[PDB]
């Protein structure tokens, strides 16, 4: 009895996120192959750490602070921004982020898309 | 009311088009469509659940595209595929389709999933 959400998050070729806003910090639980392809991290990398990761030095602090205050409260955000690999190559990250909540209106988790989009920019 | 399944928020919320596809029920049905998939071609969630996603295509359709993806079903073998395909509108597009099947613990197939995206525009250079 597998999970065909799970193996749709596993197997699709755009980069996805799961966090839990209930450990500190709001740290990554789930990061898909694609993620992992993207940013050239290994899953023990990325699990257990908070997305803050993937910025550096040209990242805009006005796009860090939208985001930042649309995760504080709870709404969704599409943005792009500068990241960095681990390699330390800076891309455009075209990131969508939607809250997930509860029947009752508790949040549980986080939910994220993130596409390099380099080459579009670019133009 | 239960604790909500993230990979199922993860695809709800998702921009990128996707489906869901159950083989043991005849011909394939999708079984569940996130609301990408429903902006994207412009149905309803109860104009496309049920139906195959055959649905899609129409007369500028390549017949060799079909047969290409109807043989990597059938082998239950993933298939990256571009494809002429219709919105409800009757806008002809480019579907750029990407298939995985789903297998059990066992090896034994359950389920087929899928991304679109429009990429009209990347392939008109
Ligand atoms: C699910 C999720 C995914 C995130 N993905 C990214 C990402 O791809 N890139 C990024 O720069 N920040 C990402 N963030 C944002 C950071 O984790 C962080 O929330 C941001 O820096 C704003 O807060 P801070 O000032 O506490 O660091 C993500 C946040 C969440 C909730
Ligand atoms: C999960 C899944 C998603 C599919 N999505 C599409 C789609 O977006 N567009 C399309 O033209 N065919 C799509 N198909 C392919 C058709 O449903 C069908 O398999 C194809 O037309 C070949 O078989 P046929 O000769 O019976 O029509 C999908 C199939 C599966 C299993």
Redo the contacts with the bound molecule.
């Keep these: 009895a597998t999970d065909p959400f799970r193996a749709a998050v596993e197997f699709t070729l755009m980069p996805m ?3 839990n806003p209930h450990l500190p910090d ?1 740290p990554i639980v789930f990061a898909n192959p694609a993620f992992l392809k993207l940013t050239g991290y290994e899953a023990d990398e990325v699990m257990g750490r ?3 990761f ?2 550096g030095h040209g ?1 805009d602090p006005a796009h ?1 602070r939208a ?2 205050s649309a ?1 504080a409260a709870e709404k969704p955000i599409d943005i792009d ?1 500068i ?1 960095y690999k681990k390699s330390g190559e800076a891309f455009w ?1 075209r ?1 969508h ?1 939607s809250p997930v909540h509860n029947a009752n209106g508790r949040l549980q988790h ?3 898309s ?1 596409l390099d989009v380099t080459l579009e920019l670019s133009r």
Excluded: A, G
């Design positions: 996120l799961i966090t709001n908070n997305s803050r993937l910025q990242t860090v985001i930042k995760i921004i990241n990250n990131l982020i986080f939910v994220s993130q």
